[PDB]
Design an enzyme around this catalytic site. Structure first.
Site, PDB file in Angstrom:
ATOM      1  NE  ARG A 149      -4.062  -1.816   2.170  1.00 49.70           N
ATOM      2  CZ  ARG A 149      -3.956  -2.912   2.933  1.00 49.70           C
ATOM      3  NH1 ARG A 149      -2.971  -3.077   3.800  1.00 49.70           N
ATOM      4  NH2 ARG A 149      -4.880  -3.874   2.815  1.00 49.70           N
ATOM      5  CE1 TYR A 176      -6.367  -0.997  -6.823  1.00 48.81           C
ATOM      6  CE2 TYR A 176      -6.197  -2.992  -8.100  1.00 48.81           C
ATOM      7  CZ  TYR A 176      -6.219  -2.386  -6.880  1.00 48.81           C
ATOM      8  OH  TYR A 176      -6.112  -3.120  -5.717  1.00 48.81           O
ATOM      9  CE1 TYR A 204      -1.851  -1.897  -4.707  1.00 48.58           C
ATOM     10  CE2 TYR A 204      -3.099  -1.134  -6.584  1.00 48.58           C
ATOM     11  CZ  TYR A 204      -2.868  -1.134  -5.238  1.00 48.58           C
ATOM     12  OH  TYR A 204      -3.676  -0.329  -4.459  1.00 48.58           O
TER      13      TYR A 204
END
Ligand SMILES: [Fe+3]
Ligand SMILES: [Mg+2]
Lengths: 198, 212
Positions: free
Chosen positions: B56, B72, B76
């Protein structure tokens, strides 16, 4: 130029490079990412949360367990898992509509709701639903009367939530299978109300 | 960290790109999109190289404009790659060599994090609490809209977890704390400029203090 994006190789090339860099060092077990892909696509599913809602709608004792110890209720079905180890179910009522978000990222009860949809991870939803949930829901096709309080749950820690929506009238006597069909992913997230044909 | 990722309450965004029960397509919309989560789990559970909280935070450490134009799942990819370089498992050179081109990463951390607070309180359902008026430059699981605001406890978890502000930096002093469902009136958080009723934030014990 000012505020321009940095140069980047195609994202697919970068993602597969990450994989190959790790896999070529023996750090990724055989079939490890393929296995997760299958879990994500096949096992984690809002059909599980729909099963839980339908059971709660027809079994007062399970409803009460789900609302007091959601982890225990879910474990009865074998549906605990990653991002779904500490479950709290929140109950809609005639004067309360619950809605779930992760304003800081995407946190979601994966095993019983499925991985979050693109829209839930959007900046529009993350910024707006905490401050103007009534307008967001309305824009999304769900009208919540002024007589209902809207309560937004921001998933900021390890609690993972599911909404228990109101059972709509016109479903009296339906079977669990019939009830499950009208509980959708969006109903579990809280942005939709279960609909019955007429 | 008061980064652009802390979006709740920002004004100016348009419509959420969804109508209820509309088709959302398959779980993954590209053949690479399962890789960031799968490799995150590889890093956490097989390599033991980092915690979920460190993922995170490294996403929060994307350069702000980079964050805002990146989809998104790609954030990551960038995040996990960044941690693999920071933890010494991979190099940026081999990533760019394999990728055939540039692979910019998140920015270095500007905070070492902080330990689980030494002094906290065990709160009870119904008690009034204030979110500590504190500014944390590294990772924290408190969205700024609730900093300094008062709400009531509706739940104390029966499990405890490492303090994010520590484990999000890989520190050894994250201890463990329960979290609390804290209910805020909408008007407490946004005054008259809200159409909601209440907001419940799940807040670590170390973010809270008695409201008196
Ligand atoms: Fe999240
Ligand atoms: Mg602002």
């Amino acid at each position: 130029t000012e505020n321009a994006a940095p140069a980047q190789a195609p994202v697919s090339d970068r993602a597969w490079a990450l994989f190959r860099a790790l896999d070529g060092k023996g750090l990724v077990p055989d079939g490890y990412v393929e296995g997760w892909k299958k879990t994500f696509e096949e096992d984690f599913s809002p059909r599980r949360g729909a099963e839980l809602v339908a059971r709660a709608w027809t079994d007062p004792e399970f409803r009460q367990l789900l609302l007091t110890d959601g982890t225990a209720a879910v474990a009865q079905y074998g549906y605990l898992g990653p991002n779904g180890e500490y479950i709290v179910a929140v109950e809609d009522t005639p004067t309360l509509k619950n809605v779930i978000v992760c304003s800081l990222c995407s946190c979601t009860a994966w095993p019983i709701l499925g991985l979050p949809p693109t829209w839930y991870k959007s900046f529009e939803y993350r910024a707006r639903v905490v401050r103007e949930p009534r307008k967001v829901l309305s824009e999304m096709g769900t009208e919540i009367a002024s007589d209902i309080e809207i309560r937004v749950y921001d998933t900021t820690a390890e609690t993972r939530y599911m909404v228990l929506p109101q059972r709509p009238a016109g479903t009296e006597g339906w079977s669990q299978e019939q009830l499950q069909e009208i509980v959708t992913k969006d109903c579990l997230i809280g942005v939709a109300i279960p609909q019955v044909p007429t | 960290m008061d980064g652009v990722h802390d979006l709740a309450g920002v004004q100016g965004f348009g419509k959420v790109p969804h109508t209820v029960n509309a088709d959302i397509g398959p779980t993954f919309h590209a053949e690479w999109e399962h890789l960031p989560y799968s490799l995150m789990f590889a890093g956490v559970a097989e390599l033991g190289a980092f915690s979920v909280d460190e993922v995170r935070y490294v996403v929060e450490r994307m350069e702000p404009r980079h964050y805002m134009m990146t989809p998104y799942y790609e954030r990551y990819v960038i995040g996990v790659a960044t941690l693999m370089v920071e933890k010494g498992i991979l190099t940026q050179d081999e990533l760019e060599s394999l990728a055939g081109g540039p692979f910019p990463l998140s920015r270095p951390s500007e905070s070492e994090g902080r330990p689980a607070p030494v002094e906290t309180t065990t709160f009870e359902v119904g008690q009034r609490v204030r979110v500590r008026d504190e500014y944390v430059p590294g990772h924290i699981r408190m969205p700024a809209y609730c900093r300094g605001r008062v709400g009531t406890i509706s739940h104390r978890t029966t499990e405890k977890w490492p303090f994010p502000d520590a484990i999000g930096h890989g520190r050894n002093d994250a201890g463990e704390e329960p979290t609390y469902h804290v209910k805020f009136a909408a008007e407490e958080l946004f005054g008259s400029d809200t159409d909601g009723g209440s907001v419940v934030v799940d807040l670590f014990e170390g973010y809270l203090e008695p409201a008196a």
